[PDB]
Design an enzyme around this catalytic site. Structure first.
Site, PDB file in Angstrom:
ATOM      1  CG  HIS A   1      72.807  40.528  15.128  1.00  0.00           C
ATOM      2  ND1 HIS A   1      72.361  41.696  15.708  1.00  0.00           N
ATOM      3  CD2 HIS A   1      73.826  40.881  14.308  1.00  0.00           C
ATOM      4  CE1 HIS A   1      73.078  42.714  15.256  1.00  0.00           C
ATOM      5  NE2 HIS A   1      73.971  42.247  14.403  1.00  0.00           N
TER       6      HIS A   1
ATOM      7  CG  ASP B   1      69.743  42.069  18.011  1.00  0.00           C
ATOM      8  OD1 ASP B   1      70.326  40.964  17.970  1.00  0.00           O
ATOM      9  OD2 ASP B   1      70.228  43.096  17.503  1.00  0.00           O
TER      10      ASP B   1
ATOM     11  CB  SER C   1      72.410  46.458  13.099  1.00  0.00           C
TER      12      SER C   1
END
Lengths: 396, 346, 396, 50
Positions: free
Chosen positions: C68, C98, C165
């Protein structure tokens, strides 16, 4: 048996106090009726604040705390962890660091925390925070040193979800390593992690409030922001990579020495200035009377000048043990009073807008620490040897 | 009619049946126009300061055969009101521009047609979040303001569109992107003065070659004046619009200037004659249309009130538009119309 | 003295890097004016992203990070913890997990973390996360293993309130146990606790990107959802307990082999399929060319078929060191190019929609790893031995 | 001016190639200009002497 932080917490808690502030402020007058489907756009209003503080001098009853708690206080109360209650008075505050000093009135048998050396902190180091999250009392939470800035704000995960920026940050030895703060000004409450002023800076800012009345931080007196603001566009600024001067403060050194809104500072003592930020922080590493030559931009303008004490950190009704906004002036050149108010209790006493006070009601008042040192020893007869430049009057 | 009022809840059930007939050389408007409207307004007292409310209004045509049904929701919203602070409501409601333009929308049958429904923030439409402040916290009698947001209403779902879809999507002439608007009105004794502004993003479906008046946003600026006392009603509004006024089925006007004026008098014996003038002048329209009248008419009429529940009226639309290529292409009516109505209401 | 995580953090930090991505994307054209009381409903737009990564191969300068962060990157910069700056290029990415791989251009004296064995993790185990929460830098936070999935996403309370994150999840020995991710796609930011891909899966997905160009994950090429969706109702589906087929993907195996929107898969190789979820996850435990027979439902329909590489994980302007969306085709049967664009820099070079490339500008290109292995060794003369089925042309 | 057009093809008038306006413009404000009493340079023309 099992490990526990309770044994050192018992040696620490007696130094942590609770603080209840009562004070007022100016709010706008509500316009009625109220229409919640109509997005629109003077009277004193009492408010209550509460926070934590740390006893830093057992003898003098000196407690360090956040400026966002005691700011605008009229009445500040302190309750020890054993339950004894006391009154406190403002001795100092500094909105930049969000750090303030207070003094318990009439201390008796107090315990002070030992301050550790901030400079020896490292990221994996263990941390413990103590504060009053939601009012319900004194909560301790634990964790580690997350980021060591490197101003050295300390970052730690020992915070609290949705709670108000508590106070003490202590290491595993029970020594003070930082005072937790709130970087969400005129709010209190965190961004997700915790920010603390390091203990060494706390010690330093704190002593200044004691021995001078305020912290020696000089301001360039400009006010402005980045090159993105609506005014940097609405006024179309050429070459954008610096600090935008929205206005030059009155009676300032920037004003006095020369400068006018629009110019974008590009450097400070040779070094590049790419953002108000960079600049606001750089001017904060320079005590009063210092001289700092910076380059401006209009077509290619540049000057050199000397700054004076900032106006953010000032005093009010705590200089004269009685009751009534001065601050220090240059070096030990007396105490210069600033913007008087409307109630005029102090103006009513023959004190204008720029009145210095070198006379300690008889003696030398090179500063507010001294001045206040006299308005506390001899509360009998008081004649303020004030001289606002020329007039050297002696009011009571 | 208030049919319920008990323990702090009130329900008003209201409506009307308008037995209505049009006479016109234009056979698309000629004939039976009978219709009914029904609605409710409810309010509930939460505290002495806080009231909750809801309103719903529905129109059902009475001029069709029984194998069809032509009906729609005019408004449907729920809200909260706090004494001396303001109100908020959300749903299908009127755009804030109508706070000002409603002042001339007082004619027996016609009028109020320099704009339409589902036409950005100009009249009725979906997804309005509306904040209102009455009397400025109760400190300035007669001064009201409002700020309003409208969420996107885009392409229909389930029709193979690959962008711009919303659950409640529709044809491009009735779409809108996100919008914001505001209104201010002041009324002292009989007099009134007001202004409004709206700004809506236009959707990609609206900005194709199939429609005139391509543009990033639809904007409207409105001023209005009113006098309402001594059995005399006078009002006028002027609005300047950008990519906001429909030009029949062609699309929108690059710029339009709209003007409406009305004069009315109420006789003691129940007769209320009315005189009005409306015009909408479009500019820089594209496709060689250049400057053209979108609307232009004089309205003469009268209503007779038997009481607050029964009335009858005649309204005569003297249509000053001439039959030309432009009006033919857009499908704009250029013929006169006489309306005759008989109305029961509760 | 006192315990601290600083001693192992000092052996770990040199492996954690910061990542600054610059890139663009397609945004819709703003319609004006803007009416905030009007709920409505093509141009490239630059954006900036920032995240953390972990050096996983010191020699090759291989850094693992979240997809991401680097997704849609045009320019990806890396800054070591000592402050040295480098440039990086995409080598691989996989939106499902991801997880993405990058390579520092011109590495010099790098340190790589040691990867621990994810399989030996247990819930009370201690955990430490390292990331760049709000941009302000590299923050470390500590905690424990909260849930061991059992795909084995690792759950840990070493997260951050309202932050993005981060990246590395390390045990008390400084070994990599998982890369922290964001399950709040096309957002970044957490649900309240932390989710990490386990180190063993990271190792596995990562090697694939290296030795093939992408990860070998076959797709059934259907797209759809649950039996609650408006379309499952608006189309009234009989017997609801499975995966709703909203559409069969073009040029797919589901398409090729046979299937049409509406049928609700009920099983996969005999086993019950009660939700798209169950299915999406099951098809993810099967590498390309595999054969999986599943039962559909229309009246009682069922088929058997073989899937090909998914389309989510693909390559772009990093195959030819130059600049310009291919992916692998079946086993080592060359590199099949997919949907060409509008700017057409690569289509302009004689490359259609389904053009394979078995010729390594002269040699064998069974895959993108190899192909790219040649467009990096001999950047002089380039003749792409492409053959899109029949036409076997040789463009430059 | 007329003779110049004849004997040269155009009039000999040199440009400083800047383009801009006064210190009141929205760009002089939106960019906040210090010391305002002169010509605001909104842009320097390409391939110019400026």
């Amino acid at each position: 048996q099992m490990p526990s932080l309770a044994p050192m917490l018992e040696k620490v808690m007696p130094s942590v106090v609770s603080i209840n502030v009562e004070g007022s402020t100016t709010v706008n007058t509500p316009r009625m009726p109220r229409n919640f489907q109509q997005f629109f756009g003077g009277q004193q209003q009492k408010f209550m604040a509460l926070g934590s503080g740390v006893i830093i001098d057992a003898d003098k009853g000196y407690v360090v705390t956040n400026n966002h708690v005691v700011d605008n206080a009229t009445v500040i109360k302190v309750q020890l962890s054993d339950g004894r209650k006391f009154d406190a008075k403002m001795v100092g505050k500094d909105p930049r660091s969000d750090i303030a000093l207070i003094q318990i009135q009439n201390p008796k048998n107090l315990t002070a925390i030992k301050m550790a050396d901030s400079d020896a902190l490292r990221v994996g180091d263990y941390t413990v925070a103590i504060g009053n999250p939601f009012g319900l009392g004194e909560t301790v939470t634990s964790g580690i040193v997350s980021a060591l800035g490197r101003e050295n704000f300390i970052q730690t995960d020992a915070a609290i979800n949705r709670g108000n920026s508590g106070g003490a940050l202590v290491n595993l030895n029970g020594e003070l390593i930082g005072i937790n703060t709130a970087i969400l000004a005129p709010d209190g409450g965190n961004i997700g992690i915790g920010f603390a002023i390091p203990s060494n800076m706390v010690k330093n800012l704190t002593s200044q409030m004691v021995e001078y009345g305020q912290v020696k931080r000089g301001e360039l007196g400009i006010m402005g922001t980045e090159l993105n603001s609506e005014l940097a566009k609405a006024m179309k600024v050429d070459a954008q990579r610096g600090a935008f001067v929205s206005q030059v403060l009155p009676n300032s050194s920037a004003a006095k020495a020369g400068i006018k809104a629009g110019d974008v500072i590009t450097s400070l003592n040779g070094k590049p200035i790419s953002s108000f930020a960079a600049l606001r922080a750089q001017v904060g590493t320079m005590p009063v009377g210092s001289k700092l030559t910076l380059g401006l931009l209009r077509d290619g303008k540049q000057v050199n000048v000397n700054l004076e004490l900032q106006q953010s950190s000032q005093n009010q009704v705590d200089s004269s043990s009685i009751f009534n906004e001065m601050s220090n002036k240059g070096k030990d050149q007396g105490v210069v009073v600033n913007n008087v108010k409307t109630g005029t209790p102090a103006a009513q006493i023959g004190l204008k807008k720029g009145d210095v006070i070198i006379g300690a009601n008889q003696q030398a008042v090179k500063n507010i620490a001294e001045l206040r040192k006299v308005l506390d020893s001899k509360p009998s007869v008081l004649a303020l040897n004030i001289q606002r430049g020329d007039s050297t009057i002696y009011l009571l | 009619a208030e049919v319920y009022n008990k323990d702090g809840n009130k329900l008003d059930l209201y409506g009307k049946v308008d037995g209505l007939h049009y006479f016109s050389d234009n056979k698309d408007v000629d004939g039976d126009q009978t219709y009914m409207r029904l609605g409710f307004k409810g309010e509930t007292q939460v505290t002495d300061q806080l009231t909750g409310y809801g309103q719903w209004e529905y129109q059902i045509q009475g001029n069709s055969a029984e194998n069809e049904n032509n009906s729609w929701t005019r408004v449907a919203f729920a809200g909260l009101k706090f004494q001396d602070v303001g109100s908020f409501d959300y749903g299908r409601n009127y755009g804030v521009v109508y706070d000002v333009t409603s002042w001339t929308d007082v004619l027996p049958e016609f009028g109020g047609d320099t704009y339409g429904s589902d036409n950005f923030m100009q009249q009725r439409g979906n997804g309005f979040a509306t904040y209102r402040n009455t009397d400025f916290f109760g400190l300035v009698d007669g001064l009201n303001f409002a700020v309003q947001y409208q969420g996107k209403n885009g392409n229909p779902s389930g029709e193979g569109f690959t962008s711009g879809v919303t659950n409640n999507g529709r044809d491009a002439l009735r779409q809108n992107g996100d919008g914001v608007g505001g209104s201010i009105t002041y009324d002292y004794e009989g007099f009134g003065i007001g202004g409004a502004i709206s700004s809506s993003k236009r959707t990609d479906a609206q900005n194709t070659a199939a429609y005139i008046g391509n543009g990033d946003r639809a904007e409207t600026y409105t001023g209005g004046l009113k006098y309402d006392a001594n059995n005399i009603y006078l009002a006028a509004q002027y609005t300047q619009t950008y990519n906001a006024t429909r030009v029949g089925s062609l699309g929108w006007a690059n710029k339009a200037q709209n003007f409406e004026a009305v004069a009315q008098y109420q006789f003691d014996f129940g007769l209320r004659p009315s005189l009005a003038y409306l015009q909408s002048k479009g500019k820089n329209l594209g496709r060689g249309y250049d400057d053209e009248d979108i609307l232009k008419y004089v309205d003469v009429g009268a209503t007779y009130y038997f009481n607050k529940n029964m009335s009858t009226y005649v309204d005569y639309k003297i249509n000053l538009l001439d039959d030309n290529q432009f009006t033919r292409d857009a499908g704009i009516n250029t013929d006169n119309i006489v309306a005759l109505g008989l109305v029961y209401q509760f």
